[PDB]
Amino acid sequence: LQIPFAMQMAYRFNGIGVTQNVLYENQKLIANQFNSAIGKIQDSLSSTAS
Amino acid sequence: EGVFVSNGTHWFVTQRNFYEPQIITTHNTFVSGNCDVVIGIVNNTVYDPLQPELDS
Ligand SMILES: *[C@@H]1O[C@H](CO)[C@@H](O[C@@H]2O[C@H](CO)[C@@H](O)[C@H](O)[C@H]2NC(C)=O)[C@H](O)[C@H]1NC(C)=O
Ligand SMILES: *[C@@H]1O[C@H](CO)[C@@H](O[C@@H]2O[C@H](CO)[C@@H](O)[C@H](O)[C@H]2NC(C)=O)[C@H](O)[C@H]1NC(C)=O
Ligand SMILES: *[C@@H]1O[C@H](CO)[C@@H](O[C@@H]2O[C@H](CO)[C@@H](O)[C@H](O)[C@H]2NC(C)=O)[C@H](O)[C@H]1NC(C)=O
Ligand SMILES: *[C@@H]1O[C@H](CO)[C@@H](O)[C@H](O)[C@H]1NC(C)=O
């Protein structure tokens, strides 16, 4: 069933007991923290095989 | 507890796993802040069930 990704994340916030409006009011920050965090995965796996 | 949904002309709130449209009201919803913050918000009346009772 399709659902907009910002609304799928609002359901997933609401599932950990954080109210939906915490996402919609912080959506740019939450997206920046996510894009940054995947950038660290890419750097770590390039930096070391270990 | 639900999702906002439109049939193409009206707006309703429904539970997420079975289509059950309700009128949007001050019970079905909660406020947080002003209209300007949320990315992709829309405009509708929200019915307040007390107001017709204060009309008597
Ligand atoms: C919550 O933490 C985030 C970082 O995790 C803070 O976000 C930064 O805010 C400053 C301005 O105050 C910006 O210069 C940075 O670019 C922001 N970072 C990101 C990744 O967007 C945020 O300020 C913190 N909020 C509170 C209330 O403490
Ligand atoms: C969408 O929901 C409305 C409200 O339940 C449906 O009802 C009709 O809405 C039109 C205006 O769009 C009114 O003129 C009719 O009098 C309403 N009829 C009834 C039975 O209330 C509407 O049919 C629904 N569907 C669409 C495609 O808008
Ligand atoms: C949603 O409703 C608000 C409130 O009526 C609308 O904002 C006003 O729109 C008029 C017409 O463009 C402007 O003259 C006002 O200055 C606006 N007020 C503010 C505080 O911005 C808004 O345009 C509506 N949005 C949609 C998509 O219908
Ligand atoms: C949805 O995406 C389109 C581009 O495909 C954009 O123009 C529009 O402003 C977006 N609307 C909402 C409600 O996010």
- If you take atom 7 of ligand 1, which residue's CA is the nearest one? A29
Helices of type H across B1-56? 51-54
Please state the atom number of ligand 2 nearest to the C-alpha of residue B12: 2
Distance between CA B6 and CA B21 in Å, rounded? 9
Interface residue B33 vs chain A (CB under 8 A): yes
The partner residue sitting opposite A21, judged by closest CB among B3, B32, B39, is B32
Q: List all residues 6 or more positions away from B26 whose beta carbon is below 8 Å from its beta carbon.
A: B46, B47, B48, B49, B50
Q: Is A15 exposed, middle or buried (0-12, 13-18, 19+ CB in 10 A)?
A: exposed
CB B22 within 8 A of CB B28: yes
CB A24 within 8 A of CB A6: yes
- Mark yes or no for CB contact B39/A27 under 8 Å: yes
Distance between CA B54 and CA A22 in Å, rounded? 34
Query: How far does the CA of residue A6 sit from the closest CA of chain B (Å)?
Result: 9
N- to C-terminal Cα separation, chain A: 39
CB A23 within 8 A of CB A44: no
Please state the atom number of ligand 2 nearest to the C-alpha of residue B7: 1
Tokens of A10: 């609002």
State the DSSP code for A16.
T
In the chain, the amino acid numbered B10 is H
Experimental method: cryo-EM
Q: How many CB atoms lie within 10 A of CB B13?
A: 18
- Mark yes or no for CB contact A6/B32 under 8 Å: no
Helices of type H across chain A? 5-15, 21-24, 27-47
